[PDB]
Design an enzyme around this catalytic site. Sequence first.
Site, PDB file in Angstrom:
ATOM      1  N   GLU A   1     -26.504   2.820 -31.636  1.00 35.92           N
ATOM      2  CA  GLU A   1     -25.056   3.236 -31.716  1.00 35.92           C
ATOM      3  C   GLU A   1     -25.291   3.937 -33.163  1.00 35.92           C
ATOM      4  OE1 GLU A   1     -22.275   0.495 -31.279  1.00 35.92           O
ATOM      5  OE2 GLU A   1     -22.964  -0.504 -29.351  1.00 35.92           O
ATOM      6  N   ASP A   2     -25.437   5.433 -33.150  1.00 42.21           N
ATOM      7  CA  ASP A   2     -25.377   6.237 -34.158  1.00 42.21           C
ATOM      8  C   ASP A   2     -26.274   5.955 -35.260  1.00 42.21           C
ATOM      9  OD1 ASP A   2     -22.976   7.524 -32.801  1.00 42.21           O
ATOM     10  OD2 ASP A   2     -21.839   6.051 -33.800  1.00 42.21           O
ATOM     11  N   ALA A   3     -26.972   4.811 -35.235  1.00 44.36           N
ATOM     12  CA  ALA A   3     -28.151   4.592 -36.238  1.00 44.36           C
ATOM     13  C   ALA A   3     -29.478   5.586 -36.035  1.00 44.36           C
ATOM     14  CB  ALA A   3     -28.808   3.182 -36.121  1.00 44.36           C
TER      15      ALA A   3
END
Lengths: 120, 731, 99, 248, 422, 125, 149, 54, 50
Positions: free
Chosen positions: B694-696
């Site tokens: 998640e968005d990392a």
Amino acid sequence: ENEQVSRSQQRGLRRVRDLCRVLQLPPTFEDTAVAYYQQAYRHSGIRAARLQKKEVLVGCCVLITCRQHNWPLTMGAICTLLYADLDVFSSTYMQIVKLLGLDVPSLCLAELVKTYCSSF
Amino acid sequence: INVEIKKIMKANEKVTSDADPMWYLKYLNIYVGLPDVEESFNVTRPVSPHECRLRDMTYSAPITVDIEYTRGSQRIIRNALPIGRMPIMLRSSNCVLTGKTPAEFAKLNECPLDPGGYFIVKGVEKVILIQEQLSKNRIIVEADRKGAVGASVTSSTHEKKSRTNMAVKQGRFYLRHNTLSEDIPIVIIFKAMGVESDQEIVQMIGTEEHVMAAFGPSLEECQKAQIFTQMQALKYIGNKVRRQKTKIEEARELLASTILTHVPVKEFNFRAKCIYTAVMVRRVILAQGDNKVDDRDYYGNKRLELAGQLLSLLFEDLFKKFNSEMKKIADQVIPKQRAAQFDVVKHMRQDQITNGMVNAISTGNWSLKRFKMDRQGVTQVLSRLSYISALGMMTRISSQFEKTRKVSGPRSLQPSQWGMLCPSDTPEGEACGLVKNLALMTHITTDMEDGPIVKLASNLGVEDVNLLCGEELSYPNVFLVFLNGNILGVIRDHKKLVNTFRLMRRAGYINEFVSISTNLTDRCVYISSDGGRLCRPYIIVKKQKPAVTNKHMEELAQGYRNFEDFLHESLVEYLDVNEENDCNIALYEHTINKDTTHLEIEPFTLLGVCAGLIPYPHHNQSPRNTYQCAMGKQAMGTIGYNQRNRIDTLMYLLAYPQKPMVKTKTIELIEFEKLPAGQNATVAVMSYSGYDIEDALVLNKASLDRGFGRCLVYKNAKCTLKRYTNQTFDK
Amino acid sequence: RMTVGKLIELLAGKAGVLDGRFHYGTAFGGSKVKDVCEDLVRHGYNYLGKDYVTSGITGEPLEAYIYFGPVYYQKLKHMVLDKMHARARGPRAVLTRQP
Amino acid sequence: PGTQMTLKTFHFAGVASMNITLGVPRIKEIINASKAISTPIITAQLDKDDDADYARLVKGRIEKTLLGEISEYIEEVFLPDDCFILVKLSLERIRLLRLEVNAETVRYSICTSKLRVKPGDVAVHGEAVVCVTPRENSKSSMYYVLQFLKEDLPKVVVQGIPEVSRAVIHIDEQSGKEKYKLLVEGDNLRAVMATHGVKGTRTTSNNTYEVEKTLGIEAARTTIINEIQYTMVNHGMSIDRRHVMLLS
Amino acid sequence: DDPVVQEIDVYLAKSLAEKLYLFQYPVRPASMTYDDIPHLSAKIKPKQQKVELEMAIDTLNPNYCRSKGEQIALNVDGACADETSTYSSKLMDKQTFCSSQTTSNTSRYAAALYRQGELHLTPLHGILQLRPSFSYLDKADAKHREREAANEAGDSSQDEAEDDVKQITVRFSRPESEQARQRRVQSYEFLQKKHAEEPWVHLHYYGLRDSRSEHERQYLLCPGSSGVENTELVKSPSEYLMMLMPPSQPSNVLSMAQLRTLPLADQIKILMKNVKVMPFANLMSLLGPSIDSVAVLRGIQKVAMLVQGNWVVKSDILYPKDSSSPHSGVPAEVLCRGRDFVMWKFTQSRWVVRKEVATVTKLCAEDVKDFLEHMAVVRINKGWEFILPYDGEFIKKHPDVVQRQHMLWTGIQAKLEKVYNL
Amino acid sequence: LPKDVSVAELLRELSLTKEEELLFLQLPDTLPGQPPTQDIAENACTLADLTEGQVGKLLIRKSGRVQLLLGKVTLDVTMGTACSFLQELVSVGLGDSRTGEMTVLGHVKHKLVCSPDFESLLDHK
Amino acid sequence: ETLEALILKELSVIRDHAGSACLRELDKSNSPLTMALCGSKGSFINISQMIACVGQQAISGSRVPDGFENRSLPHFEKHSKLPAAKGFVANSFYSGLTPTEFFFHTMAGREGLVDTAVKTAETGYMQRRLVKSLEDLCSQYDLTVRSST
Amino acid sequence: MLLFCPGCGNGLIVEEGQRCHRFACNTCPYVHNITRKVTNRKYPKLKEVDDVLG
Amino acid sequence: ADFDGDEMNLHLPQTEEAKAEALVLMGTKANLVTPRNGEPLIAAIQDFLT
RNA sequence: UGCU
Ligand SMILES: Nc1nc2c(ncn2[C@@H]2O[C@H](COP(=O)(O)OP(=O)(O)OP(=O)(O)O)[C@@H](O)[C@H]2O)c(=O)[nH]1
Ligand SMILES: [Mg+2]
Ligand SMILES: [Zn+2]
């Protein structure tokens, strides 16, 4: 405190502060001046004195506060802005210094030289 | 500092005391001088902004004045006396940074790319944000709390500001003011303001059948009472007046000066005010039908007060306070002190104005009692997170609301922000919609004299409103003409008037910043000349061909002409919101049609400074651009060429900053490529090890070891060794 | 998120670093996709950014091509070293004896 | 669910009109149980759900109809013998709307909470003519009250419930049969159920206070449960009925 | 669109310039006029014009209520006092129209009397709006007040002699402050008293139906010939525009107009400091054809040099003696020497090498780049080329100037060889 | 009542009928002239400074243009606000310091406005 | 309102047809298509908006209101109810959005942002009230839910 | 309708005199007897037939 | 959460009874479903469904 | 004032 104070002492303190702000001296100088004025007012001889006497007292307290920090300030301009004459000014200055006994640093020559050269 | 201060000094040039007449204090001319420091023993010395930041002092200049007074009836004059210290803005006219080359900037330890325009007080950098408020002296028709469609007008003159409303709660027009005990009918005010004939009142209100049907109830309520003369109406108004024939005199005074201050009366001649209230009632009647309610979020009725007006008001208030204090000290000293003649020089406070300005700029809270203005958050600490952060914070705009209610109206993006403010640049959080940034290409107008404007309006055939009755206001072809909220008069065939006014403005006999707009729904032509209005340059298009050509562009590139020459040759002109509301604009040349008056200079200028960094923003989403601007306001990078000598409480620098490969024209203009705030890395879009769910993102150990992403955090630890009252010092 | 602008920026940056130029991402304009595709096909790289990449762990090629390219990443001031916090008993407030 | 809901719009429930407050504001109003709610909706069934004529008839019966909305012209005529207001009823529009309102019904509606006009003041001359001749009441009122009469006469109710503001005919087009029902934007369920032709046994309302005062506390509980469930389903999110039952 | 017909003439009359007033009734339509209403008198004043008309209205007409007339008469006046009565009889017979001033100056307004083939214009001395005033109601209010006072006094049948001797209540004529005095002056009562101080003048009314009307109507005309050339009204459009709109009172700050308003020398100096590259023909076209070519040449020879037929601004004009390099801070003399060397290299050869120029002048890359961009452009595989082509026309037209520039460049080359030791 | 135009007004006043009519025209503040020997300055020049005689001409071009040639410049005359209330033109001559005469010259019905042709004044120079 | 509804229906039909055409022309193995199919992230609506054509920018369930007098932006004629003048976005994110389309999209985005901002506080207050009101009930052992009293 | 007195211009009210109804002002003896019929129609907007929804 | 800079709190009970109650009642394996409608919240997410 |  600030309640066991007379209207004369309050006027003297306000004049001290007004002259301090006119000469644009820092709040530390203002505090030292008011402190020395209160210390001088503690005495009765200066307490029950003349109006010119207490005006010259304001002036001399400002002068002592200005000297204590090695700041140059001419007694001539002090008298000019204090509504007083040099004779009575010096007389009351000698009287109050003999009555108190505070340290009176000598007026440095270089500081006064710079202060007067900035005028031209 | 050049004109407004002199005007304030001229307005408050003379101050005298009631006791001991023939005594006065006359100001001749005030100077601000160059920035100096009071460190030396009664000696001035040029001080640099960097030195001020280092020593935690204020970067101000000594305010001096030449005065003349009478000590003992002998006139004594002073050619130069200090009275205060005004904090000098960086890169100003009197600043030491202006007119300096990069070499001199380096010698003075200042960055050449620094935007400046901020004050330095006690070492901290404060910026005065642009305040956005509603336009004054304008009728606003809107629904009341319960939902009663009424009108309001906030007349604000140089002295007082009074808001008066008009409601139709019970089918009749009741006028409400803060100085009246109870709202009174409008017909009584009509009868009190000189016009006593009900026929004339109805002709001024309107001649339409529905207008008369809606105004009938007011006439009936007025006839129910025995008020038929100006004397009786004034007596009723006086009886209804609150405490601050004597009642009649007070009522007349409030009607002439208090109510509708913006409408001037020559000598107790309320003709203009009667016409104004009649036009207001007509607008209210017209709005009572079709729901044509004006919106507050329309920026055409907004005004932006820059730091100049705020500082002028503050200086005026402080000067008035100083004059009052001096007059009081004189009244207390001169009559009972001694034969020694008293003069002001011995009580002229030189720290009053200095401390006032210092506090107003540092604390940010402005409390003007003469105007009853209590504002907060005017000044904010300049964010030195990055050059982009500083340049974007310098061009912010705060609103008058200041998070009072989640209205969503002013927080929404209005179409009126075209070309003026950045649509995408907005802080993400509770301040979304209230804090905005200016566009890349825009301007804020100033105040003009309004003399030649009125002269041209009178010469163009504008009939005097006092010459004819109000019946002419109900005609369909007769259009009203207003000047800054004041009824300038009437006119016919407003097309000719507008065309001639625009042609004269383009010729140059009228200031290019004077805006002219026309609203047909109300048949009103507004001529705006007040300052704070937002304007934007546009190329003039005549007969499907712009005035600017390749030859003109080549001349500009070679240096034969400039933007001022373009403005003078009737090629490019400034348009206001209200003016573009009526004028037609084209985005590109291919979009130009027969009905076009102007052409868009550049479309990408719609975005602001923070949004200009977005590469290909028209291919992304709006929330994405908002978050990108919000994070660029905090991006890490170099601040300036003096970042090593600069000492701040918190600074973030990058080891190996690199300029972007895909750089925008806005980047090239703002010179961000010289002070980049990031690095270009070979990114591969893919999923790897599932540590980027998640968005990392996953970084390379060897890349981080070879210096990629290396950052430096600089913190400041300050200590003070001050001397107390007693002769002792910290050691 | 419909961030096609990021892909366009990546392709433009790849073309720029290949041809020794600086592409422009001007709003409502700038370098088109066809120009950068021509630059890529002239320099010998794929006209869509996707290139043949081999897995480093297993050493075998991937079934799908990876989208490589230079992107301008910027680090923010939000640091985990500064945001990390752990509170023991520690001090308390005078009025109410709480942390 | 309050946070999960985005407070959407355009959810007219299939009528493309009658904007109703749904979502977090509606849940707030429900949990507060205010006596007066915003945009109340009353759904009533018909005994003859297939006859549009009967549907319109019951619509006109329940809906408030003002005098100025049916009268074609009201003129204040001052004949040399006397001054009076003459109202001409549009019998064509009356029979088109299917309203059981005649000159006698208009006369009976007049003289009700209107400055105490005596029955002798109003008179009927023709089939659709109404003559009103006021008299000075001596209470700061003279013969010149025809203006107030012209102002407040067209807004007098002649047929329908005063509380009802707008009744519409909704249609359900189920493949089995197309039925009609009444959607009233009023705050009076008792009158809607008491009106003729309305199947009061299957009448629902959105105002919990009215449902309580009319059909009882159990009816109020059931209405609250149904309204909460409907408002929650409108947003696509579901909640177990036990939670709303415990809340009610 | 030409004046095919209707070529009417305009004449001016000054007979009734100071005796012509414009009275308009905002409440009386144009259909009904006061020609049949018998007038009585009119009160006026020469200064602060405010006319008050006193007319008479009929009573035996059916549009008059005799009972209400008697009532209003008894309310405004006494029973049989009749010493100061607003009406002679016991009925409302006189009507009062008060005048309101529209504007102070009416010089821009003029009455136009139209005849066959001529239009006569007569100035107006005043414009006033007449409206029915209500002063009988104020007089009735005063009457009611005095009647209430009389009733309060006669509350008893026999009123004893009241010992209400007026004590000496002489208040002080206190010295009024300036603010209070200004307030008193601006008060409405003071203005009303000042207006009332002026005495009134009574005038008779002569209706339009009277013979005096047609007798005096001819004064609006003026005796004069049909075609007369007016001595005045002969100013040009530019003069008329200047009259009707009188005035109020980087290095490219000055605009084109501000530049043209300066002398030719300053114009050429600024143009050179701005452009630094421009042909003589372009300079002439920008300055204007009305300026002499010899003058333009004398002006440009002092602030520019000839390089391949084109004119390049001198180095000292761009870099004053007190200026310095904005990138390195070196004195302006070194920058001038470097720019002179660059110009000499350009005059000797059209292609100049940046690396050679830098190695010779010992200057920095940024300064060399600025010097090269000021007067040249970058060409691939060729170095730097002069921005403008070789202009041989000016060289062929002015050979003496070419020789002067050649000897000046020879001297500059000698100086450069002495300094840099080429 | 349709809104008339100045050209048609003059046409129907001169050709359709011959009866004289009183008009009221609003002239600009400053006329294109100089006060003749009036002790000055570029001040305002009104009708009070000009003398009697022919001062200008009134031209009616095609397409309804109505111009006033008052010298080297040419103004344009348009129809002003259509006043419907009573306007009586009167001359109040104070022949004596104690008694004067008020003479009703006629009635005013139409209003005209003369404006400088700023477009022409600008395109001329 | 009938014209408004008809125009909105036509624009929705155009959007749906463009999305269907894009889904039919796109080949398998496409990452956006596979992600929309598996439901991990994205959807056919977003795919069509970023490939085929963006939908009608709806503000408060309606077209872009007229900010100026009788028109949304000065670049369009007065009383003009065209799709491109009222909010329709003909170009896609790949081809680039025009200035007016980008401005309308930013308007919609800021509207949604402020809506969510108000919703946060509103639902916080509602949840606080509901919890403070319902925190007293509990399930007893006799299968009867009773309050604290 | 709304009528005004030609004398002063104030609103006229309908009253009953000694012979016939008449318009009269409250600030002057002016009156006007009614000779023929006088009417003032308003034509209020009728309620349109609200059609079915769905 | 979205792993975009979210700061989360971590607490350590100071009593065995509190520890046991947190492990039993607030257990992740025991709270795999929400009490609103019983739908499971702890399940696959992006980069796992694909 | 920023962050989620
Ligand atoms: N960094 C930071 N700055 C603040 C903070 N609060 C206030 N400020 C400054 O103060 C302004 C707004 O704060 P306000 O919310 O008005 O302060 P407040 O209303 O007292 O907030 P409360 O203290 O919560 O009532 C901002 O525009 C900032 O200028 C804060 O919490 N952190
Ligand atoms: Mg997050
Ligand atoms: Zn009357």
